[PDB]
Structure formats: C-alpha cells, structure tokens
Amino acid sequence: MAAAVRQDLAQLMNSSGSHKDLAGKYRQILEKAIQLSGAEQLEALKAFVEAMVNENVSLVISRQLLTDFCTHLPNLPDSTAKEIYHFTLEKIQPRVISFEEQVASIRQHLASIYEKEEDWRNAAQVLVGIPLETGQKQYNVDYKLETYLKIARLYLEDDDPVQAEAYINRASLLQNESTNEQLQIHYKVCYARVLDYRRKFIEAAQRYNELSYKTIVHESERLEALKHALHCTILASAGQQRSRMLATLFKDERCQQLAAYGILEKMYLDR
Amino acid sequence: CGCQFTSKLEGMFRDMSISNTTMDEFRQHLQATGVSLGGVDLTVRVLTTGYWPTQSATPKCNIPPAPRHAFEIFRRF
Amino acid sequence: IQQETDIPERELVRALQSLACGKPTQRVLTKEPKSKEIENGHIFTVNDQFTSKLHRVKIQTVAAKQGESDPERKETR
Amino acid sequence: KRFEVKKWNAVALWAWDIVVDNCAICRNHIMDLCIECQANQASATSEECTVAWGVCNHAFHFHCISRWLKTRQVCPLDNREWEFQKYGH
Ligand SMILES: [Zn+2]
Ligand SMILES: [Zn+2]
Ligand SMILES: [Zn+2]
C-alpha cells in the first residue's frame, strides 16, 4: 500500500491550508506508513522522505516531520531502515544548508548503529560527514567535542589514525572551550589512548599518570589507566624522562596490586 | 607610503584579478556543459577575506532552486 | 517569510521595506494594510505599474546616501 | 511561473586550509611541545610555549618561529611576511 501513501502525499502537497492542519495530516500519513512492514513500509517511508525534501513542502513541515520520522526509526530493527539512511542522507542536499540538525541526528544514529555491527570503518566515515565547522547551527562545544571524540575513538578501534591525529586535534582545538568535566575526562582518556597508539608511549604514560590521581574516574578505570601508564612506561624509549616516570610509578600502592608490579620493580631497581 | 596599508590595498587588487580570471575560467567550463545542473547566466566573482573589511554578518538565508544548482556547480567546480 | 525561510534579524525588514515602504509610484510589491510601520499579518500583492515601462527596470532603494554615519565612524576610530 | 531568475552575480569568498596535524619547523605536532622544550615540566611554569598564528593562517609553535624569525623572516610556507595575529589556539 506504499503507492496509496505516495498518492496521498502528492495530493497533500498541492493542498492549501493552515500549517497546523497540514502538519497533522502529514503526521497521520507518516504513522500509517510506520504501521506497515517489509518492502511496503520501506517504499512508503522513501516517498515520505522524498516529499519532505520537495521544494514546495514547507520547511517547518520538512524539518519537523523528518525529525519525527527520525524519532520513530530507532524502533525499527537493524535492517532495511539503513539503506534509507543512506538514501535520506543523500537526499538532503538542497536544504542541507537550511537545516542540519536532522542530518547530524541521522549520522549519529548511523554511526552508533554501525558501531553495533563491529564496524568502526564505515561508522567513522559517516560521522566525519557531520559539518561541525559550519557554525550557523552552533553545535554546543560539548557536542562538537563529543562528535570529534567519537570519530577518534572509532578510528582508534580501526587503526587508521592518520585522520584521527587531525581529529584529536579539532577535538583539542575546541577542547579549551567546553564545560563538562566528565567529557573532559573522557577526552583525556581518548587523547592518552591516541598518544599510546602512535609512538607517544612516554607521553601517554604521563597523561595516564595524570589521569590516575583523579576521583570521578572509576576505581577500576583508575587502576586500568594506571596499568596503561605502567605498560606505556615500560614500552617507552629508555631515557631520562622514562626513568623519572618509573620513579613516579614506584609510589602508587595500586601499582603494587598490578601483575606488572614486579616488572618495573626489577626495572627501576636496575636489573 | 612603504610597507603599510598600501599592502592592504594590494590584496584588494588581487581579488579583482582573481575574480576575472575565475570569470573567464568558469565561462570555459559552462561552455563544456555535459553535467551542468544550473546552466543559466552566471557572473560569479571571487574575493579574499584577508583584505576586504567586515561587510556584514554574511547571512545564511535560503537560495532559490535554480540559483542553488548554479551555486552548486561553482562550489563543486 | 520569517518561518519558512530561516531569515536573519532586523536587516530583513530593511530588505523587505525596500519594495513596499517608502516607495514611489513604481511599486512592485503592494500590500492592503497601507501603513508606515511593519505589521505581522499583512498580505502582499503585485502591481503592473505601467509608468515603470523600463524594460530592465531596477529598484535602487539601497545606497541612498553614502555618508559614513557616526556609529561606524566611532568604532573605526 | 510569474517571476524567473535569469542572471546572478553572487560573490564567493574563500579561506586557506591549515592542515593542523603537525607544524613544519620542528615536525612534532601542532601541540605537545617542540624540539627546544621536549618535556612538559622542568621550568615551564604552566608551559610558556604556545601556538602562534600568522595573517596567512599558518600555525607553528611560538618558539619555533622565534628561532625562524631571527635568521629569516619570510614564513617558509608562502611568501607573506608572517604578521602576528594570534597566540595560542
Ligand atoms: Zn611544531
Ligand atoms: Zn616549547
Ligand atoms: Zn604562514
């Protein structure tokens, strides 16, 4: 019955009336399409997306119905609703400058959904597509930080962090603007992870050690971060800076709890 | 003057030079056609922000569809 | 024009009033509520205006007097 | 239609890219210290070594260009005279 839904949308497009009445009628049509299933639901929603992006349709009807469309979609399972995500993302290009909140929401939903199917490759590329630089929709510094942090974390799990270097940067570039301490802590953990990955084992150990003496970080995470500091310190380049870090790590009693406690104990005590 | 605001006037002139070079360069590419979406009469100018002072807030209003395709060609090109 | 356009601030009115408010007998955008101040629920129409038989007729409401007023004069000082 | 657009004379503005992932004077990173400073501590006093921005929108460490500006003065990535437009990022 997707053809009937498309016919109703085409007739409603040429109808004249108040904005509230048209929005309610479009919402009812959207609900009827959602009640469908299989290919019929897919085609009905495809026509709904095509109608919203259409020039004649009001932007208010366009932005909100697409938003209300995006609210019902996470209910539909990990299936045919993702080919329309690529379809809907592709369709938004004439009004991509008019509104980009829905584009960001779809990309955020798609990135997490790709994250579900052990796919940090495509999740990264989709989330890069977000134009955080634009600024007319001033994404709150936390949101830009959260997005850039997610791209770096996705790239870290995929290990192609030539771009994640440039992405931990743009996270850092707007980092000294944000407020959320937990987001800042989540940033420093990811930033220390980036340092650990590339070559900066000595710098990651410094960052991990700085994050080790915190309070809001979970005690298990604090032990894990310190364990990351200990491993990075052992793996770093043997020098004056690394010797000082070994001396610093020979102070924590939760270093002693770790299995590598013996390793640096022989190490710093010159064996 | 020497190495002063005359240099600001230098950049002002460079922008006019780039505007006309891109003008004829875009003329050649609209002649090629083939994949031209908004193939109507366009006279697009290119300037640099380093020397032109703040004109306004540079708003982000909407654009009519036929100019949108014309703008999409130039930005892509 | 303010809800389905994503229009900027008061600068919209100056652009909008250029066709209706303070217009000679060459109006290209007329309205029923004839008044100086701008309302909200006022309808726009169009007039033929045969007096403006000019083929490439232009509405040069902008650049009425290039005079460098004080507010920009003080800030640039 | 009643009104159709025939001509358009829009003006397009553009700005340079920076590729903020590594500066060219020392090749360490845009942040995370320079070759003349190495570690974070050892008489840094909140790390008095930040990123400097020129009028040409290039970015390097403050100390790296300082050693560059004493010998030459020509911003090795362009031929602008490298004015000083920002301090830090
Ligand atoms: Zn550098
Ligand atoms: Zn330094
Ligand atoms: Zn430069």
Side-chain angles (χ1 to χ4, degrees):
Chain A
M1 293 178 294
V5 179
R6 181 177 299 181
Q7 181 181 0
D8 295 0
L9 291 171
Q11 293 178 0
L12 196 55
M13 280 169 50
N14 302 330
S15 62
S16 60
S18 62
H19 297 173
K20 183 178 181 180
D21 297 330
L22 296 180
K25 291 178 181 180
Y26 274 115
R27 183 176 292 102
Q28 292 178 0
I29 294 179
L30 177 60
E31 292 182 21
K32 293 179 181 180
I34 295 169
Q35 288 178 0
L36 309 181
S37 60
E40 300 180 1
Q41 183 184 13
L42 177 62
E43 297 275 33
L45 296 186
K46 279 182 178 180
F48 181 81
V49 171
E50 290 179 359
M52 290 311 111
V53 192
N54 189 273
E55 304 88 4
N56 294 326
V57 173
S58 162
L59 294 175
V60 187
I61 300 172
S62 304
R63 64 167 186 268
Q64 202 38 56
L65 274 296
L66 284 173
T67 303
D68 306 332
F69 170 84
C70 294
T71 59
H72 281 267
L73 265 290
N75 290 319
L76 188 153
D78 210 355
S79 67
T80 186
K82 280 70 180 173
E83 187 266 331
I84 192 167
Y85 287 165
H86 314 304
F87 167 75
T88 307
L89 273 182
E90 182 179 1
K91 291 325 289 174
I92 306 295
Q93 58 93 26
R95 277 96 164 99
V96 71
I97 49 184
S98 296
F99 57 89
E100 54 269 20
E101 184 70 27
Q102 291 78 6
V103 179
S105 181
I106 291 174
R107 291 184 184 273
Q108 286 286 347
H109 293 177
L110 194 57
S112 304
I113 282 178
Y114 268 102
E115 182 181 359
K116 292 180 179 180
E117 308 171 1
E118 293 188 3
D119 199 335
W120 304 268
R121 181 75 267 171
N122 303 347
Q125 311 149 9
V126 165
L127 193 63
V128 175
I130 294 191
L132 284 180
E133 183 45 64
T134 50
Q136 67 273 15
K137 277 212 155 69
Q138 173 40 54
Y139 305 109
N140 194 1
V141 184
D142 295 331
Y143 182 85
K144 297 181 184 181
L145 193 52
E146 283 171 284
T147 304
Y148 279 151
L149 265 176
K150 192 175 184 179
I151 313 174
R153 288 181 298 181
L154 291 173
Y155 268 102
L156 281 179
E157 302 280 60
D158 187 76
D159 195 7
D160 191 57
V162 184
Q163 294 80 17
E165 285 181 352
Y167 296 155
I168 196 67
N169 295 343
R170 291 192 290 177
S172 181
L173 305 196
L174 63 95
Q175 170 72 49
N176 281 343
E177 288 203 13
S178 66
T179 63
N180 193 17
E181 176 57 49
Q182 183 180 359
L183 187 52
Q184 290 176 3
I185 282 301
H186 290 354
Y187 176 75
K188 295 177 182 300
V189 168
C190 177
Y191 166 67
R193 287 183 63 178
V194 168
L195 299 185
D196 178 28
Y197 265 88
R198 309 282 63 70
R199 175 51 199 91
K200 274 81 77 173
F201 288 68
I202 185 65
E203 296 186 2
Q206 293 175 0
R207 295 301 179 181
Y208 281 135
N209 179 269
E210 290 176 359
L211 290 176
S212 83
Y213 301 90
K214 299 290 101 177
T215 178
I216 68 172
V217 179
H218 204 316
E219 191 65 28
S220 60
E221 300 181 14
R222 285 177 56 183
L223 184 60
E224 180 66 28
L226 177 71
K227 178 184 179 182
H228 283 300
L230 172 47
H231 290 191
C232 292
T233 307
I234 300 177
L235 296 181
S237 179
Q240 210 196 10
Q241 303 195 29
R242 184 165 170 266
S243 300
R244 295 194 301 262
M245 186 54 58
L246 283 165
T248 304
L249 292 184
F250 206 61
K251 304 301 154 285
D252 287 329
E253 308 293 275
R254 54 171 190 279
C255 277
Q256 310 192 331
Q257 315 309 131
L258 296 164
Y261 170 47
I263 307 187
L264 75 163
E265 176 156 50
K266 322 302 151 282
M267 182 80 187
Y268 182 74
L269 291 174
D270 177 69
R271 278 90 185 272
Chain B
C1 318
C3 60
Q4 272 49 69
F5 321 112
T6 57
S7 87
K8 300 289 94 175
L9 182 48
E10 293 174 357
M12 189 69 73
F13 269 66
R14 288 176 262 201
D15 312 327
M16 280 282 101
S17 65
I18 307 317
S19 68
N20 59 64
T21 53
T22 317
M23 163 60 192
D24 61 68
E25 162 192 288
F26 173 62
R27 282 301 302 179
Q28 298 174 0
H29 295 86
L30 66 89
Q31 177 264 351
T33 60
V35 294
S36 160
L37 310 93
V40 298
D41 293 320
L42 270 295
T43 46
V44 55
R45 309 182 183 184
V46 168
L47 313 177
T48 68
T49 180
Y51 299 88
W52 298 75
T54 181
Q55 181 271 328
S56 182
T58 60
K60 58 95 175 179
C61 191
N62 67 324
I63 294 291
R68 273 185 187 184
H69 300 350
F71 185 80
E72 282 181 0
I73 296 169
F74 184 73
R75 188 174 185 178
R76 284 298 179 274
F77 155 69
Chain C
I1 64 180
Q2 79 171 353
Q3 182 68 211
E4 306 176 1
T5 313
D6 300 69
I7 192 81
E9 197 52 32
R10 174 63 169 79
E11 55 269 17
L12 72 87
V13 183
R14 289 190 293 271
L16 179 64
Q17 69 94 12
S18 59
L19 298 185
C21 180
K23 280 289 301 177
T25 185
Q26 312 282 43
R27 300 180 178 267
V28 300
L29 183 61
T30 60
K31 81 178 77 65
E32 287 82 6
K34 300 297 297 180
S35 61
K36 211 277 179 180
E37 59 93 19
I38 185 67
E39 296 86 0
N40 300 118
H42 55 281
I43 311 300
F44 290 166
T45 50
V46 63
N47 191 20
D48 172 58
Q49 292 278 17
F50 192 30
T51 79
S52 68
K53 183 55 173 65
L54 299 167
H55 189 281
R56 192 248 176 274
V57 59
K58 57 182 60 59
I59 303 99
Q60 196 179 0
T61 46
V62 300
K65 261 165 292 172
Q66 184 260 334
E68 285 87 6
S69 68
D70 180 66
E72 66 90 31
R73 170 167 303 272
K74 183 58 181 179
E75 71 91 11
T76 195
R77 171 63 56 167
Chain D
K1 297 179 298 181
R2 40 177 60 179
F3 296 83
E4 298 182 0
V5 181
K6 175 83 43 173
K7 292 180 175 292
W8 194 25
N9 64 9
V11 170
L13 206 64
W14 63 264
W16 294 94
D17 290 355
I18 308 93
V19 187
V20 252
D21 47 27
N22 210 335
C23 103
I25 323 231
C26 73
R27 280 83 65 193
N28 317 315
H29 191 73
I30 52 170
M31 46 186 203
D32 294 330
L33 276 295
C34 67
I35 56 155
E36 218 191 336
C37 286
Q38 300 305 274
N40 305 112
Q41 211 44 43
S43 60
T45 75
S46 82
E47 191 44 50
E48 303 307 271
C49 187
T50 61
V51 184
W53 283 85
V55 66
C56 65
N57 211 34
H58 288 124
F60 318 92
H61 301 123
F62 184 60
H63 296 164
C64 295
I65 62 176
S66 304
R67 310 175 269 181
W68 184 246
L69 283 178
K70 68 183 175 65
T71 52
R72 290 176 178 90
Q73 52 194 358
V74 291
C75 181
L77 276 67
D78 61 10
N79 203 3
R80 281 77 173 184
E81 190 64 24
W82 183 258
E83 293 290 328
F84 266 95
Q85 210 159 56
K86 217 185 196 66
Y87 296 99
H89 205 104

